[PDB]
Design a protein around this ligand. Structure first.
Ligand SMILES: [Mg+2]
Ligand SMILES: [Mg+2]
Ligand SMILES: [Mg+2]
Ligand SMILES: [Mg+2]
Ligand SMILES: [Mg+2]
Ligand SMILES: [Mg+2]
Ligand SMILES: [Mg+2]
Ligand SMILES: [Mg+2]
Ligand SMILES: [Mg+2]
Lengths: 197, 191, 136, 172
RNA sequence: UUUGCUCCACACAAUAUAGAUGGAUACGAAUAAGGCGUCCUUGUGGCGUCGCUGAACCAUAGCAGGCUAGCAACGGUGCACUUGGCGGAAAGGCCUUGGGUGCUUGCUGGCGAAUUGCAAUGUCAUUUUGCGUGGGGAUAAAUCAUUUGUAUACGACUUAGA
RNA sequence: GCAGUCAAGCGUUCAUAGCGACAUUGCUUUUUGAUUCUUCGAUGUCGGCUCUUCCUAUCAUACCGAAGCAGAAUUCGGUAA
RNA sequence: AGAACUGGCGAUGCGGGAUGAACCGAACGUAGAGUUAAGGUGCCGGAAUACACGCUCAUCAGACACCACAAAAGGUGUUAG
RNA sequence: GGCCAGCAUCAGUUUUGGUGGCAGGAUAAAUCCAUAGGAAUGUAGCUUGCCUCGGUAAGUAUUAUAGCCUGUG
């Protein structure tokens, strides 16, 4: 029930996340996925490196240019999977992909704004404890993606500043928590507890 | 069949003090300190009374249980390592050409340098791992001794030296030339 | 220095546990475990609120942080006197969980006129609080 | 097949002038209804005696309710069944509150572990084991130990909303 | 090339909308673990407490929100000024010192609304340009045609010329 | 045509390092048969020259394992086009 | 390639088997409302990321009749006997 | 009397809820109460390695300062 939804894509499974995002877009809902390089995939690394090499060998024989494109960045590996689940050659399907924005890391506009999670795609709950999985930053790098260590440092910059903002908010919420406790005494506090609030 | 619960007992001596949060197993003792990440394994450590700790598995399959017995041993060996320490001894074997081994410096890293293995010009370097301490044994001919806290380091550092000296394109049944691990032991005596 | 191992403390399923039912004909009423069958199913028996004695699947019930003494496989007559002996109803009712349950039930049942009163009172409390934030 | 019940069936050929008053044979069937229960009877009387539904008659078809519906027992179920190759015999070991429930698990289990269908199985004899230490199997025996406690690690929470604002914990 | 060009005020006109109608309400990590408070010996520390969904929290009374008569506070927030900070991943925003100014349902009063006739979204958003009002600001290039050959099928390219 | 399985005889002693008969279970469409679905108001019917690309059932070239591998010289098998 | 009985396509659209003469469902004047068949209910795509007991992890997993293939022979992989 | 609506009482087809009275079965089976026997996943009690101000101890014991099962009413 919000005009933009920002989904911190970390600890998620590509396909299970990808299925909910596609349906939301089609129904009219602006979505923006951040932090794509922390995503996960069921099954061990070596399996999933070999699935990407199977995609690479497919190309238009008479002229490689016109044939299928292989994007290596994790934002665009997630985009592919999501473009699969939308009727993208119609005008309705374009408009749905126009409501979407994917990003490696968390750039300026979106890092002072609340982020949410999709629990039905969240791999901590869905996978059985013991099964193997693949991190989508690691995989991208192994098929040539040359901005892992740039995103690894930029994220470390904002984690520090975000940790500094929270120390001032958490200290301020203690004062507000102490005030609501002491105010909870006079008849105005007792009448709301009867009335429910 | 899924076992309702299985558990083993890590028996701690009097000297050391083993700390565990999440699954990061610190073990401080007389020889030094050792650490180990176990967050890959899925078990619950539980203290009872200082000199005994229980490891447990609940609703575990067959393979899940097996690992539970492994985690006991790795944690046992940190305890025996930091108290007693590990010591591997290796020997050189040859017929015609004697193997010349020597520790050499290179950007403050320390390498074991094997020279004249079987009449070869190629010099063979083996980098010395962090913690392990190599010394060539006096009054025992063609012997070398490695020693330290970790087994995982010492044994690997020995096996590296063992694997640097292989004979290619000959009959190894005949050409039995090399540097072989003779005795695995502890540093301290008694136990 | 001592060892200092952590714990991973848990709510167990055993004889004498008290539980809250998620979904069913009972749904939201307290019950107590009598005897276990296997990993997934157990035998409950809540003698008081209005829940038959039944084998129930652990997917359809939630465990509380409370246990009372009970012999294995005790009959409803024994469990009824044991529950009243345990003094568990007032102990459940005194806790935060049950208070939070009792609140969202009270917020549901709230006539349009009262929701106004609430607004007239919270505006009135707001003023007394924000002066305290202004002072210190 | 379905949520089972237990029935009693009795039948006795048809009567004749040369031989009035035949013999009365009886069985205990597990089925979802009476119509399947009558059919199973005539299936099992054809495997033994020289009779069929044309020559025969049913005398009384009676439901058998459970004797102690809320008491935990240890059943020992024999069973005969067809594989793809041959046709074998077994002894599984089940623990439940009623006989009809033990039969409801046994059919579900033989389907998982062996790919044996309803058609390919004969329940020979379900027998309640009165005494303890008359349990050959291991996976029932674990639960028979004294002062039995066990946790439930890794709790999950089925949500109504698609998005969530907190980030969940798997504590219990 | 008939007072052209540009940014800022308000005045009228057009032409649209993949679709406002209280608030996108900011740690990070773990999940066989943690959050929030507190006390020390600041640690992988002791003690307390929470979860079992945001069913939350914040805002929410006046003609689509009027005109006035008071009380208690020295709070609560908009509107244009103003002092100082931080933000380069796509920063285009965020905090902040000091006045000015409107309101204040934090509490008590005095007026007004009818007739849109028993319902008819009953119109209150935000893009892109035009056109005149009146206050600042700034005073060039490119192509053809001629010319070079580090270039050249033609175009293109590379040079020179008040 | 290519591959297993069982292993007769061999390989001075010795079934299985390696040669490997006959049986029994398959894959291939680079052979030839069998058939006649498409084309008889026409799809240019051998080979060579020229030139790109693909397959691996790998002759060589890289790293390995076995040997009835002292060395040299070989033989068998694995990853790999 | 040639026969026996029945049902069909030919002469026949409509829903299902992605696609298809013959398979499954069902056979058609023109409209409204209800209900189902065969088939289905993560997203494409209208409809349960339903409930329940189990099995399986694969450095070629497996995924719905007709149908678009796989065998002998092996495996202290794991599960029931 | 033309264009378009809203609200009532009615009829035909239908869809989705709340709710009363009866019948059947082992005249439900259970639970629950009156009752005879029985025992191990053994309560109190008793006795022994006993021993960190008292619990453990591994035997006995058939309800006692837990209880449980089976027949019959
Ligand atoms: Mg022809
Ligand atoms: Mg033609
Ligand atoms: Mg041609
Ligand atoms: Mg190959
Ligand atoms: Mg014809
Ligand atoms: Mg037809
Ligand atoms: Mg098909
Ligand atoms: Mg048919
Ligand atoms: Mg849908």
């Amino acid at each position: 029930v919000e005009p933009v939804v920002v989904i911190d894509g970390k600890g998620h499974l590509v396909g299970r996340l990808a299925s909910v995002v596609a349906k939301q877009l089609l129904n009219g809902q602006k979505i923006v996925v951040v932090r794509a390089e922390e995503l996960n995939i069921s099954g061990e690394f070596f399996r999933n490196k070999l699935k990407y090499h199977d995609f690479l060998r497919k190309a238009t024989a008479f002229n490689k240019t016109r044939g299928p494109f292989h994007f290596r960045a994790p934002s665009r590996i997630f985009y592919k999977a999501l473009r699969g689940m939308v009727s993208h050659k119609t005008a309705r399907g374009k408009a749905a992909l126009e409501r979407l924005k994917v990003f490696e890391g968390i750039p300026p506009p979106y890092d002072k704004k609340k982020r949410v999670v999709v629990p039905q795609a969240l791999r901590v709950l869905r996978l059985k404890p013991g099964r193997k999985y693949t991190t989508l930053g690691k995989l991208s790098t192994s098929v040539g993606w040359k901005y892992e260590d740039v995103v690894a440092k930029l994220e470390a910059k904002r984690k520090v500043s975000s940790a500094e903002y929270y120390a001032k908010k958490r200290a301020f919420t203690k004062k507000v928590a102490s005030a609501n406790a002491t105010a909870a005494e006079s008849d105005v506090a007792k009448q709301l507890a009867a009335l429910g609030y | 069949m899924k076992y309702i619960q299985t558990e083993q007992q890590i028996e701690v001596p009097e000297g050391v003090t083993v700390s565990i949060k999440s699954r990061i197993v610190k073990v401080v003792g007389p020889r030094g300190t050792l650490t180990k990440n176990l967050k890959h394994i899925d078990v619950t450590f539980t203290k009872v009374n200082n000199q005994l700790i229980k490891v447990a598995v609940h609703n575990g399959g067959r393979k899940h249980v097996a690992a539970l017995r492994t985690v006991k041993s790795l944690v046992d060996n940190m305890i025996t390592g930091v108290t007693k320490g590990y010591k591997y001894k290796m020997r050189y074997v040859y017929a015609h050409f004697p193997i010349n081994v020597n520790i050499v410096e290179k950007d403050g890293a320390k390498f074991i340098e094997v020279r004249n293995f079987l009449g070869d010009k190629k010099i063979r370097n083996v980098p010395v791992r962090d913690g392990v301490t190599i010394e060539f044994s006096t009054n025992v001919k063609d012997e070398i001794v490695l020693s330290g806290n970790s087994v995982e380091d010492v044994s690997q550092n020995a096996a590296d030296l063992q694997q640097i000296c292989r004979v290619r394109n000959k009959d190894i049944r005949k050409f039995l030339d090399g540097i072989y691990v003779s005795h695995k032991g502890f540093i301290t005596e008694d136990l | 220095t001592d060892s200092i191992v952590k714990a991973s403390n848990w709510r167990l399923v055993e004889v004498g546990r008290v539980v809250l039912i998620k979904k069913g004909q009972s749904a939201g009423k307290l019950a107590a475990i009598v005897e276990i069958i296997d990993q997934k199913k157990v035998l409950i028996d809540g003698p008081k609120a209005g829940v038959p004695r039944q084998a129930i699947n652990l997917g359809q019930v939630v465990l509380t942080p409370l246990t009372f003494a009970l012999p294995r496989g005790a009959r409803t007559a024994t469990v009824s006197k044991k529950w009243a002996a345990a003094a568990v109803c007032e102990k459940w009712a005194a806790s935060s969980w049950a208070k939070k349950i009792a609140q969202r039930e009270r917020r549901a049942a709230l006539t349009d006129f009262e929701r106004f009163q609430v607004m007239v009172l919270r505006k009135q409390k707001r003023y007394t609080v924000k002066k305290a934030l202004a002072k210190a | 097949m379905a949520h089972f019940k237990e029935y009693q069936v009795i039948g006795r050929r048809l009567p004749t002038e040369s031989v009035p008053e035949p013999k009365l044979f009886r069985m205990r069937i597990f089925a979802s209804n009476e119509v399947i229960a009558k059919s199973r009877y005539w299936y099992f009387l054809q495997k033994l005696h020289k009779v069929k539904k044309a020559s025969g008659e049913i005398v009384s078809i009676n439901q058998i309710n459970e004797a102690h519906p809320t008491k935990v027992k240890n059943f020992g179920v024999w069973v005969r069944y067809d594989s793809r190759s041959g046709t074998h015999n077994m002894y599984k070991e089940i623990r439940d509150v009623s006989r009809v429930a033990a039969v409801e698990t046994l059919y579900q289990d033989m389907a998982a572990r062996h790919r044996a269908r309803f058609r390919s199985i004969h329940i020979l004899k379900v027998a309640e084991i009165e005494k303890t230490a008359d349990v050959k199997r291991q996976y029932v025996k674990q639960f028979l130990t004294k002062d039995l406690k066990f946790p439930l690690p890794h709790r999950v929470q089925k949500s109504t909303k698609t998005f969530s604002y907190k980030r969940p914990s798997t504590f219990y």
